[PDB]
Amino acid sequence: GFDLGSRYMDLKPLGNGLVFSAVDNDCDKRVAIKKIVLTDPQSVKHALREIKIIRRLDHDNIVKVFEILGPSGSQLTDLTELNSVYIVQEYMETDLANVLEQGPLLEEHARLFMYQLLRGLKYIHSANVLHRDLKPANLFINTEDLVLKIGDFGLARIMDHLSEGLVTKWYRSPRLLLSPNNYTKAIDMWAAGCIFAEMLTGKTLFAGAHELEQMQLILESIPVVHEEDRQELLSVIPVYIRNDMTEPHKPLTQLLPGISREAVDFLEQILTFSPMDRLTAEEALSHPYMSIYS
Ligand SMILES: [Mg+2]
């Protein structure tokens, strides 16, 4: 119903209305608009890093950016003299989290979406861009075409007051839990493995409520095969978890009951404890299970 600037019309919020649907009046096309509130200098730094990363990305499996708007909704030409900025971008029908709320995918859909996620990751990793917040809610779906696009580069960095409690732990790799300051390509790949499993089952694979429970759940199901890893872990993790990892639990195959052997075998090459053993996005795309799409 509301106008933003001289160009965007019929703004309707898409609980938390900082994300709107709007019509671009120069084309009469539906777009998405994210309002970004510039509160602190830690909020200006997060806005600017996000804007720089998203501007440089054009790929079939990445949400397109159209425009950056200033507080009044007029276009920016290239800013801590500003209370707010808007990001105008491709309107997407839904996100993978909304899809998985209605149950698991057929393997054929999970596989096709995985092939798109990996193609998106190969691209952003080639630009040395780490996403750092891969989860179903940041994977946008057009259901008619079965197109998956990676969006919400809010937490993204060029590889080179935490709000820790607002970051979901479910898609975090063992190395990210042990070494929290350092994002890597391999950390994105671990999250893609967890998202593949969730598409197959409709359930979070490792649903820990904090870092420690997340590590416990991963150790219950994923073996530590390198001595170097085992020694680091033994010196960091508490007694009850160390006890728990010599107790019997379900392996990956039993967390994915009735899923084809080929899907589980592919997944076992992504959900390796060590990133040294883990398929890169490029290696994953060239694995037989995925090369059927190439
Ligand atoms: Mg999101």
Numbering used by the authors: 13 to 26, 30 to 93, 98 to 179, 187 to 320
Quote the study that presented this structure, word for word.
Extracellular signal-regulated kinase 3 (ERK3) is a poorly studied member of the mitogen-activated protein kinase (MAPK) family. Similar to ERK4, ERK7, and NLK, ERK3 is classified as an atypical MAPK. Despite potentially important functions in cellular processes and tumorigenesis, no ERK3-selective inhibitors have been published that could be used as tools to elucidate the roles of this kinase in normal and pathological signalling processes. To contribute to recent global research efforts on untargeted human proteins, we present the crystal structure as well as the discovery of inhibitors of ERK3, providing a foundation for the development of selective inhibitors for this poorly-studied, atypical MAPK kinase.
Thus, we determined the crystal structure of the kinase domain of this atypical MAPK. Overall, the kinase domain of ERK3 adopted the typical kinase topology, comprising the N-terminal lobe containing β-stands and the C-terminal lobe constructed mainly from helices. The two monomers in the asymmetric unit were observed to form a dimer in a head-to-tail, face-to-face fashion. However, we expected that this dimer was likely induced only in the crystals, as the kinase was observed to behave as a monomer in solution as determined by size exclusion chromatography. Detailed structural analyses revealed that, as expected for an unphosphorylated and ligand-free state, most parts of the activation loop and the glycine-rich loop (P-loop) of both ERK3 molecules in the asymmetric unit were disordered. Nevertheless, there were several features that displayed an active kinase conformation, including an “in” conformation of the tripeptide motif DFG (aspartate, phenylanaline, glycine), as well as the canonical salt bridge contact between the β3 K49 and E65 located in the αC helix. In comparison, the overall structure of the kinase domain of ERK3 resembled that of the classical MAPK ERK2. Detailed structural analyses further demonstrated high diversity of the residues of ERK3 and ERK2 within the ATP binding pockets that typically engage in inhibitor binding. Key differences include (i) the substitutions of the bulky Y113 and the basic K114, located in the αD helix of ERK2 to the smaller A116 and neutral N117 in ERK3, respectively; (ii) the change of ERK2 E50 to ERK3 C28 in the P-loop; and (iii) the alteration of the residue preceding the DFG motif (DFG-1 residue) from C166 in ERK2 to Gly170 in ERK3. Unfortunately, due to the disordered P-loop, our crystal structure of the kinase could not provide the exact position and conformation of this cysteine.
